[PDB]
Amino acid sequence: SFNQFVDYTLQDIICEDSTLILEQLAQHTTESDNISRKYEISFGKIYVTKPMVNESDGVTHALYPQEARLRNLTYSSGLFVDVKKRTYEAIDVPGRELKYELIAEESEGKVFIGRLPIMLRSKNCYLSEATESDLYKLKECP
Amino acid sequence: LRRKTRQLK
Amino acid sequence: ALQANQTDISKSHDSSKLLWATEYIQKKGKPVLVNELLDYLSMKKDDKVIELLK
Amino acid sequence: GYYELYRRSTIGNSLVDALDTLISDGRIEASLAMRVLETFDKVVAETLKDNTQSKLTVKGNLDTYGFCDDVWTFIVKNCQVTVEQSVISVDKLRIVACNSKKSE
Amino acid sequence: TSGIVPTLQNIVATVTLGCRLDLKTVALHARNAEYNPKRFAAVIMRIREPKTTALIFASGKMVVTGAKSEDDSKLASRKYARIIQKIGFAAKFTDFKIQNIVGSCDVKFPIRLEGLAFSHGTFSSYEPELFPGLIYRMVKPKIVLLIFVSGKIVLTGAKQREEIYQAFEAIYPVLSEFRKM
Amino acid sequence: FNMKLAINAKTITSGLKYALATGNWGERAGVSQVLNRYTYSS
């Protein structure tokens, strides 16, 4: 159940309300200010890292289940999403429908959106690819 | 006037 | 420089002349004859601003 | 609007003498002459901005500077002027410059 | 004890006339003038033999700077007043007070700024990643000292020549105690 | 506009931790329990 959620459900959830549009109307106050802006933020693919922990000093290193249990830490990985920021503007002539046009500003980076706890012995856990000898090295019970 | 800020779905 | 700095009393609008004349009138302890005004604004003959003042 | 400083140059001074000489002859209206000078600034500004590429540098010692109404006024004494090649020795070179950013 | 006396580098003095001036007239008829009301609200004037700058305002106030001596400033201030007089405006010399004196010197050895910043933490303010120089605000007299790793000291805030000498003589012992190596 | 402040990672991190640390499925009870490790069969 967890593998299905992480593999497919996470992407689907973000692909429902990915687009956020803010519309700034003409705000007719003078003939020198008649342009209407439209700023759009869209969420693309989502990436998941291996389990990791960030310390107080800001150093991040791979976290294994044994250390998490002893250090009272949460066994979780990081979530990243590609964000595209687009802005549209057009000349808002009074009493007419607008035709928004791309204004040559389409930024397109990875944004951290929180940490997802990882179930042990899952596709995203370190113990899924570990053999019996590897588990003994990691102080994990086969 | 308007609120000069609105969201389109 | 001061002589050239002094702007000609021929203002764009007659209203401007009256405002200065009224300000000049108010700063006098006693009423001032028209002769004093003529010295202030270089319009000796009967000017519309003078009539507007009345 | 275009500045009238160019009227002090050789081409501007010659035009003033020519127009004024005709004014004395009575063959040109005084008001019309003013219109010519106003258009003279436009053409000189346009051609200078578009049809020149020479570069010259002047090095010397300043003897007097001045700024007022967005117009600097420098006087460089014992300065060497090079064009593009050949240096020119100048005892006293006065500089007058107006705004590069046109004032509307 | 130190055996080295700091050398003055800048003196900021102010003079007044009590008369109103026409900046535009002065700018057009003055040798060295710089009047930009959009940028600054005064006319900047410079002189050559003393090499000093003065900011003459419409209220008759001046701020002479760049003078290397008290007497040299007097000659500069008098010449500045004479220049105004020669223009035609009513200008008379008035109270001349020095508002700030800047001095510099060198101790000729490195100083452990961390040690000074710790022991004398009530006065020092050392921010390595913002300004590479320690700022020591001496309490008596009121003078601000800039201490550099190379052993260069900048003194600013003194109003008389005696205070700057006293400050350095009173700071050398506390500087030698923290000398590097 | 600062993207680092526009996106608050604390929202997702705490929301998942809180719902998992405790049994409160929100912002149902007893959804999450401390795993019993008394014996293998348990």
Added chain:
Amino acid sequence: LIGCRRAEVARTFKEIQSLIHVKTKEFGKTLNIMKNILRGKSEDGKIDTDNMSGAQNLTYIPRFCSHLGLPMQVTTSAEYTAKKCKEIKEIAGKSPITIAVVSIYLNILLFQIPITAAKVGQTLQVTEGTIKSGYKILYEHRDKLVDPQLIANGVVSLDNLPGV
């Protein structure tokens, strides 16, 4: 910034400026005033310790190397190099950020990690010329900037550092 300093995890001015947008002049003046207030109320009734010192360069090294993904062994060598880097007067007066970055760069080339300076300065936002400019000063004192134990064991040799 004060809170981070008290926790021995002090950040840099640039790091704080990334989130809170305030020009350095106001930032510096406010910090100095704030420190004075703490000192004033400390005597009234502590507040600062050896950590309160502005430089405290040793704290920055673990995070900077982590951003580059270097192993812990390289981090320890950089810490030793930075600690001994304060004995040179020509580098001691430099900014701690440059001191740490250049020290990290020296260790990066010492262990032969395939990471170019073009990316080290891009990640840490330090001019490459400054890194290389500081390397020349730091290149003349290499013998005193390498841990004796590391060279004694044989893990790193002074001949692995390119010379100009």
Added chain:
Amino acid sequence: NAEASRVYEIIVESVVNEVREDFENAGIDEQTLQDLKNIWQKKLTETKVTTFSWDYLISPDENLMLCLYDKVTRTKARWKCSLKDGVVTINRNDYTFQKAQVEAEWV
């Protein structure tokens, strides 16, 4: 200077060509353009400036340059000016430049 002469020919040509409309507004005859063109040209060659196709206060033969300034700065004893699109006259010789650099030390 060949470049200076070429620009001067352009300036005079532009003035006469552009000013025709205004003169027709004044109702003056066509020959006045020829007279203005002739008299102006003779004055230029008369000046013999270049070859042509045809105290503490402020108090041709004088060398003067008229131009525009892009940015002027100073460092405590030195004035540096970046000028462009100007005409200069030195020792009865005239030159034109797209850009110019001034580097003088204020004693």
Added chain:
Amino acid sequence: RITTLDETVGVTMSHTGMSMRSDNSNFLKVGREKAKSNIKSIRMPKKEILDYLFKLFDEYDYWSLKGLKERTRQPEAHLKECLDKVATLVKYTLRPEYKKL
């Protein structure tokens, strides 16, 4: 399937939180767009600005403060002194003494 990042964890997190790298995006920099435009002015002689106001009022009988400043391009301080002496606020309008002419 979701994509997993195989890079070092310390590298992936170098762009998160308080990082030495500075943002170089120009998106929605509203403060930057208008804060850049800034220019000062100077109070001109009364005898000239005062005339300018009367011609301006003749063009339109109800002029806003922002429009008035844009046309005059002078500090509000001096303008306020002359504006009150000539006009009144209900939008400023010329006083009946001069308007009724």
